[PDB]
RNA sequence: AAUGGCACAAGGGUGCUUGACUGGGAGACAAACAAGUCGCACAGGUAGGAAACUAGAGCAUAGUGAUCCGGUGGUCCGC
RNA sequence: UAUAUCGGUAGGGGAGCAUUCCAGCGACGUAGAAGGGAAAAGGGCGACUUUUUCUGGAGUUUCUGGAAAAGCAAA
RNA sequence: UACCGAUGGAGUGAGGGCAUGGGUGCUAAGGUCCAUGUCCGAGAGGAGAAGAAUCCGGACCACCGGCUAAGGUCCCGAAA
RNA sequence: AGGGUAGGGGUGAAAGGCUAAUCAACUUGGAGAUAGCUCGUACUCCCCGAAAUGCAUUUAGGUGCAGCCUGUUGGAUGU
RNA sequence: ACUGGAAAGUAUGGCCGAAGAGCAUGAAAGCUGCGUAUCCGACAUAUCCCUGAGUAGCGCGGGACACGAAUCCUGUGUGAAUGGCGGGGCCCAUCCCGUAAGGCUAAAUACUCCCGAGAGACCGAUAGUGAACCAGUACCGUGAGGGAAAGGUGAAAAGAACCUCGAACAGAGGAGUGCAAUAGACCCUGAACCCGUCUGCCUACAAGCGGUAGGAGCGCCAGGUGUGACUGCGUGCCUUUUGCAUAAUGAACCUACGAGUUACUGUUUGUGGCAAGGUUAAUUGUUAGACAAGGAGCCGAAGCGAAAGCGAGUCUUAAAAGGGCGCCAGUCACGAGCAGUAGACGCGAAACCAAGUGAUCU
RNA sequence: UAAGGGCAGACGGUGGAUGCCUAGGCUCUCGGAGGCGAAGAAGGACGUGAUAAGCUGCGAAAAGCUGCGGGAAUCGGCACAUACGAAUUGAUCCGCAGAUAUCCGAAUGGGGCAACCCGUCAGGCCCCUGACACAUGAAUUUUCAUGAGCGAACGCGGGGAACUGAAACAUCUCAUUACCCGUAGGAGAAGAAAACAAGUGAUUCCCUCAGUAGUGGCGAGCGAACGGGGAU
């Protein structure tokens, strides 16, 4: 193709819907709005959380809990991806190839099965036991 | 309606006059009234992914190569601007009938001045190649340095 | 303009792992000697928003 | 850009108004009146295409009745006899023979006169 | 209140008692939602009883009302 | 290829026509453009489209894609 | 032959007549309130003189072909 | 003849009279106030096709959620 | 050379090009004119020991801060310290940070009555400014104020000498000009409604939405076209309704005008690019919108718990899977649907408030 | 027999649709510039041409006067005009610099119903005319300098609604908006820690943080900052 025979992919562009333009289109007259009432008028809008005057669910239910400000949340990294990164080293904690100046916690879902010394901010007890069983070490710093 | 110059006074009293009820003179129903849902100033730019743009560029170049409109020529310079010399170059390359696009490695002011007045000729730098410009011309002419630049800068 | 979250909804609802809405049962604040122990424990437990009330709770939470 | 389809909008009306020639008074040329008249006529035409078949069958039956009474029978007796004998000539052909080929109608009647 | 149930009584007495329990809710009924109803298993420690067994209040169905803000008792987080 | 199906208001879905402008590719025009009158023909169907002639006396248009001040019978 | 899950878009939330079972009313109302069907609503065609829902019958388009329904066959008006 | 009293303000031998043919003022602006109300809503062909019920509501000619329609999908079950 | 009233058109054959932008010219011009690319050019006149007291702080009443009673401000009443003093969301202690009650300060930012040069998938005379022209004019009002309609002969006025009818150009018929006067001053084109004349057919015994389906005769020009004796069927349309020929609503008619649009943010979906990753924003560089940079940020990648926290587990428990929630391909765009915020499909109140104009009527 | 009528075609009338056309609008970009005025403004009144002036220009020197530079044959403005003149001893025109510049208007000698009436003191004419001066207020020591009024938006400051939303409404919202008033500049404001934070290092603006923390008849709603990336 050139500029003279351009063609979009099949089904990529669709024509817009145009209402209030006659009977044959199926969208004229009342123009998809029904007959009367509030919803038929220009400028009608739905009040969010309004149910006709019945007490809404967001007022019927109670508030609960609180959110801690200084919440230390770790990014989880598992043994399976540790072994995947190991199989193209034996000294992890690079982890940029991920995170971006974050705190990392090593978790035990797969298996290490290698001899690695892993440096991370946190480990689980199962993860520590797994890496030491496979013959590794932890640097919790 | 809010930008017309008439006043907001009720033209006729609400009841009793025997005609249609009327508000102010800026109504779209009245001759000289408001334009409803007319044009507003707009910005038509949108985003395409960089990799999508690169793919489109390479597709245009591949299409030119497959359809055999790419001619590689030697680099040339002009001591003084001269339209006749560029016309002769186009005639010798057999590109002077339809639209042609020459791709140059650098500015080459004398060459640009020479090609300025020719009607079916376009010039472009190698590093500024885009899909529209590549596709808009029947013939593509490259120099050796332009080929090197395009290969280095638009690969994969 | 960007959509604004409803403050009451953001104080009353929470998202679960598989995109469900977590909520607290509401009949247990101040008349509890009369009620039944099993009733009170079932109101203590954390419930989920009904499917018909979903997308309304989502509109309140800005479809999040 | 600004788009006003002046020529197409007028041409639609002119095409329809060529169809309302011959109407009475304002119904031929006044457009809202003329367009109103033309659509009601179209509903009539749909109905009358159906009614034309009944009208022509009734005319055939009346002509066959007269010719059969000339021959000595009635329509119902003649048609019963034809159906019993298995003659498949329809009422249009029978009416045409009765009006224009009385000898052929007579031979048909004589075939089932037994 | 009315209706349904009730002789092995669910009706009436005696003795001992506090199961008018703690951790609970396989599974159902009912239902716009909110609400509502019946009901486990097993563990801990008891009451009655020779034991088996029963006891998570009352023959059952009315006896109330959300959220927000406050009060009291117990036990994780902000400066 | 068969069978089945094809009345419809509110309403949902699908596929198209015309209009103004733009890009690319083609074209037409004082040996007569657009517009206006008359006539003829066409379309699974239709929105609409071609052709002939008179008036007219200078601009118009095909296809593919793009964008809308994108269609009136009642207020 | 299209019943459920999940999702996108709705409209409707003034109903009415007939038959059947009832309440109300006066065993009145083209009355009113429920229930079960049905039709009009949103349904053209045929008979009943002319009638929203009574009787027959669900219209893709064309036909100057044929058979039937309800109901009819002395004339207006098809057929004894 | 000249002058003074200015908007719910003036003036009223009091009628809610009069205040430039306007009175339980006029002009311009906020302003396209708001109107759960009435009216109106324009090209074409094809496929499908309702409801006028329940619950709640300062609710009853409005609206929310069910019920009933439609598009696209995955399951077997619907009559 | 051809057509033409007139070539810039078409067909040949040439030339210029740092100039093939444009406008004008009797039709559409790189080479007819003004210009354009490029280069040159100004007599002037302009522009470039001390350390801030009615303070810090405090009571009462208020205000501004995102905040509807910490920091900041103060009407009223009070009132220190000089290593000391202030803040870190109310108060205390430690710690940390700072040094009030004095002042000045460019840039990056906001705007367009005005001047110069440019542009538009903006309008094209009921549009676009109210205003293309006599426009804030005419007109209306005591006043404040409100507020129109109105463009086009022809290339060139060559804008019709003279004749005829007529009192007269009132108007016309000629002649003449001109490509054209049915371009003759209201002048390009010249539609509808509405109004006439001529020709063809029908019509004075006939009764309802005016059509529709049949069907002679007559009349025109070779199977077309006009009319329509006579026959069957037929209570307009819109809207609102359980239901409208309805004696419910609405329209004199025609032409023109007139009503789901756009922005942002979500969500679903069609189609795409990359893919365990996906994507840049503001902005910057080069040449002049394009190309390249820019990873801040956002989403995904692990959940459970109010939370500390633990983690394919976790919460509840003294403990038990006894129960709950979880384990057992995304992301960025383009097109479309829908939602919210904006006047948000259009027209329509009675009113409310602010600032002005009116006692020439009464 | 058509008094009249109906339908069709042709040809006219009216009217001004449509098509084509337009420098008249609309939205912007870039670069400048961002005032005018007591040396009298903006905006007006009356005049001014050979011939009445509707616009334009100009001001009793009145479609114009002078000089320098540019240029070289027509010019004497426009509303479909002629006459009569100017001009190669260089008109007209163009750039720059000058001259004149009535009356009103802040209006300023006093008044006043704008474009008018009436004056005083000195000076030059002869009841009456032409050139001066003669306002106020804050500075200055009578002299001197400034100010006043008008005007686009943007800035700062003083006052400050309501309709509306909350499906009623009073806290709240609309909104520290409309509007009134005062006052700068080419920009203004802010700005150099008695700061943020739990290491940074003055202001201002942009992208994020984030519809997050908070706030709220905890309703409708409102809504940061730290940090990070930039402009500077
Ligand atoms: K309609
Ligand atoms: K209530
Ligand atoms: K055109
Ligand atoms: K009913
Ligand atoms: K209630
Ligand atoms: K002409
Ligand atoms: K012309
Ligand atoms: K005409
Ligand atoms: K008829
Ligand atoms: K009436
Ligand atoms: Mg429909
Ligand atoms: Mg509705
Ligand atoms: Mg309606
Ligand atoms: Mg209704
Ligand atoms: Mg409205
Ligand atoms: Mg107003
Ligand atoms: Mg307009
Ligand atoms: Mg539109
Ligand atoms: Mg039949
Ligand atoms: Mg059918
Ligand atoms: Mg259908
Ligand atoms: Mg012709
Ligand atoms: Mg339109
Ligand atoms: Mg129209
Ligand atoms: Mg209702
Ligand atoms: Mg009802
Ligand atoms: Mg009834
Ligand atoms: Mg209805
Ligand atoms: Mg039906
Ligand atoms: Mg039969
Ligand atoms: Mg008969
Ligand atoms: Mg009274
Ligand atoms: Mg009066
Ligand atoms: Mg407002
Ligand atoms: Mg209004
Ligand atoms: Mg409303
Ligand atoms: Mg169907
Ligand atoms: Mg609903
Ligand atoms: Mg030229
Ligand atoms: Mg106009
Ligand atoms: Mg006369
Ligand atoms: Mg003509
Ligand atoms: Mg004409
Ligand atoms: Mg008779
Ligand atoms: Mg007769
Ligand atoms: Mg009624
Ligand atoms: Mg009827
Ligand atoms: Mg009405
Ligand atoms: Mg009427
Ligand atoms: Mg009517
Ligand atoms: Mg009408
Ligand atoms: Mg009309
Ligand atoms: Mg006649
Ligand atoms: Mg005519
Ligand atoms: Mg003088
Ligand atoms: Mg004075
Ligand atoms: Mg309210
Ligand atoms: Na559709
Ligand atoms: Na021409
Ligand atoms: Na004449
Ligand atoms: Na009328
Ligand atoms: Na006649
Ligand atoms: Na004076």
Swiss-Prot record, chain A:
GO biological process, one term: translation
PROSITE patterns, A to Z: RIBOSOMAL_L15
Entry superkingdom: Bacteria
GO CC field: cytosolic large ribosomal subunit
Gly residues bias locations: 21-31
Keywords: Ribonucleoprotein, Ribosomal protein, RNA-binding, rRNA-binding
The protein's assembly and partners: Part of the 50S ribosomal subunit.
Biological function: Binds to the 23S rRNA.
Protein name: Large ribosomal subunit protein uL15
Species of origin: Porphyromonas gingivalis (strain ATCC BAA-308 / W83)
Gene for this chain: rplO
Swiss-Prot record, chain B:
Keyword Chaperone: no
Region (Disordered) residue spans: 1-27
Keywords: Ribonucleoprotein, Ribosomal protein, RNA-binding, rRNA-binding
GO terms of biological process kind: translation
Signal peptide: none
A molecular-function term among this protein's GO annotations: structural constituent of ribosome
GO cellular component, one term: ribonucleoprotein complex
Protein family (similarity comment): Belongs to the universal ribosomal protein uL4 family.
Subunit annotation: Part of the 50S ribosomal subunit.
Function (record text): One of the primary rRNA binding proteins, this protein initially binds near the 5'-end of the 23S rRNA. It is important during the early stages of 50S assembly. It makes multiple contacts with different domains of the 23S rRNA in the assembled 50S subunit and ribosome. Forms part of the polypeptide exit tunnel.
Stated name of the protein: Large ribosomal subunit protein uL4
Source species of the chain: Porphyromonas gingivalis (strain ATCC BAA-308 / W83)
Parent sequence residues shown: 54 to 209 of 209
UniProtKB/Swiss-Prot annotation, chain C:
Gene Ontology biological process terms from the UniProt entry: translation
Gene3D superfamilies, A to Z: 4.10.410.60
SUPFAM superfamilies in the cross-refs: L35p-like
A GO term, aspect molecular function: structural constituent of ribosome
A Pfam cross-reference name: Ribosomal_L35p
Keywords, alphabetical: Ribonucleoprotein, Ribosomal protein
GO cellular component, one term: cytosolic large ribosomal subunit
HAMAP family: Ribosomal_bL35 (MF_00514)
Protein name: Large ribosomal subunit protein bL35
Protein species of origin: Porphyromonas gingivalis (strain ATCC 33277 / DSM 20709 / CIP 103683 / JCM 12257 / NCTC 11834 / 2561)
Lineage of source species: Bacteria, Pseudomonadati, Bacteroidota, Bacteroidia, Bacteroidales
Gene from which the chain derives: rpmI
Curated annotation (Swiss-Prot), chain D:
Keyword Cytoplasm carried by entry: no
This protein's GO CC annotations: ribonucleoprotein complex; ribosome
GO biological process terms, semicolon-separated: ribosomal large subunit assembly; translation
Superkingdom per UniProt: Bacteria
Keyword annotations: Ribonucleoprotein, Ribosomal protein, RNA-binding, rRNA-binding
CDD domains in alphabetical order: Ribosomal_L20 (cd07026)
An example molecular function term from Gene Ontology annotations: structural constituent of ribosome
Presence of the UniProt keyword Ubl conjugation in the record: no
Cross-referenced InterPro entries: Ribosomal_bL20, RIBOSOMAL_L20_CS, Ribosomal_protein_bL20_C
Classification via NCBIfam families: rplT_bact
Function (record text): Binds directly to 23S ribosomal RNA and is necessary for the in vitro assembly process of the 50S ribosomal subunit. It is not involved in the protein synthesizing functions of that subunit.
Family from the record: Belongs to the bacterial ribosomal protein bL20 family.
Name the record gives this protein: Large ribosomal subunit protein bL20
Native source species: Porphyromonas gingivalis (strain ATCC BAA-308 / W83)
